[PDB]
């Protein structure tokens, strides 16, 4: 189950950086939202939001422009959408693509680490490290897709 | 053949923040096909010279083999010490404090994850272990989903 393994990858990222939230949308060619995983928020909360996020704002950025970014508070971005309603507030920020060489997939991100800190070098290097292991992963699915 | 380079990107990838992470001198892995024989073996913390002089690659034997008939982490404070131990060959760089795991999907065994001599001259830790093993199963989604 090409899920499981996503959210596997997204608990690492998420438990080994000490970060509130962590999540990872995995796209198609035309942007459609295949697969949101994510951990740190309550099923409540997950129906008050309703709606999938669509790869917007600095998602979207990621998205177009695939290189790890690093944020001390993402609304503060001038590409920022903002949050919806319900959404819980967050501040730090960091998320990488989830690719192989010829194509990328996605983004696995962060955000609000413990205590208030910003996201790191070494946690932007861990993140890319589990992000690669998820590439191999969503392009073999698409092989046996 | 060499590896598929995503799979080879990835796995140095894994060993360079697991080194990083833990402040371990040296940090190594072993990818393995069918009877847990050796591969590949990819590796950093030692200069190219010293690679030349050691010549031979390791056929994974020793302690390492230990990471595959006990598939738990293994963490020893003076590695050549152990009784399994087989020794350093020539001019490779001696080392005491070891920390080891498999690299596993489920039940099936991919490789072997391994780090030595932290940099502060510590036993490896509790924090240090749940790290190694987190990237060990990231190495392993890798291996067994790599392009064939
Ligand atoms: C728990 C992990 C989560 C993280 C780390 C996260 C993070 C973010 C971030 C960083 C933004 C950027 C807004 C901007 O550009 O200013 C965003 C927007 C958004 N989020 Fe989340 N979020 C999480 C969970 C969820 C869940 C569970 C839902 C709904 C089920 C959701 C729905 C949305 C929507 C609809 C947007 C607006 C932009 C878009 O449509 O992509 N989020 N979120
Ligand atoms: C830089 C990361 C490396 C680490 C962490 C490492 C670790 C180890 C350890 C702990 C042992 C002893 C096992 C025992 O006594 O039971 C060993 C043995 C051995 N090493 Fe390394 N080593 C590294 C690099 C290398 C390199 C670059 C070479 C060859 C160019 C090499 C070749 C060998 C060989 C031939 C053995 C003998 C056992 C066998 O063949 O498996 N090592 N290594
Ligand atoms: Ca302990």
Same mark, same amino acid.
């Given at each position: 189950?090409? !899920?499981? +393994?996503? $959210?596997? =990858?997204? /608990?690492?990222?998420?438990? @080994? ?25 309550? !099923?409540? +909360?997950? $129906?008050? =939001?309703? /709606?999938?996020?669509?790869? @917007? ?89």
């Amino acid at each position: 189950d090409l !899920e499981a +393994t996503l $959210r596997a =990858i997204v /608990h690492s990222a998420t438990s @080994l950086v000490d970060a509130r939230y962590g999540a990872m949308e995995v796209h198609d060619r035309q942007h459609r939202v295949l697969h949101f995983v994510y951990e740190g928020i309550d !099923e409540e +909360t997950v $129906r008050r =939001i309703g /709606h999938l996020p669509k790869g @917007l704002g600095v998602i979207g950025l990621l998205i177009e422009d695939p290189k790890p970014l690093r944020l001390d508070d993402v609304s503060a971005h001038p590409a920022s959408i903002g949050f919806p309603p319900y959404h819980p507030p967050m501040r730090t920020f960091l998320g990488v693509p989830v690719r192989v060489r010829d194509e990328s997939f996605g983004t696995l991100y962060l955000t609000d680490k413990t205590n208030g800190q910003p996201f790191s070098d070494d946690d932007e290097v861990l993140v890319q490290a589990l992000a690669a292991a998820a590439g191999i992963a969503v392009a073999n699915a698409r092989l046996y897709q």
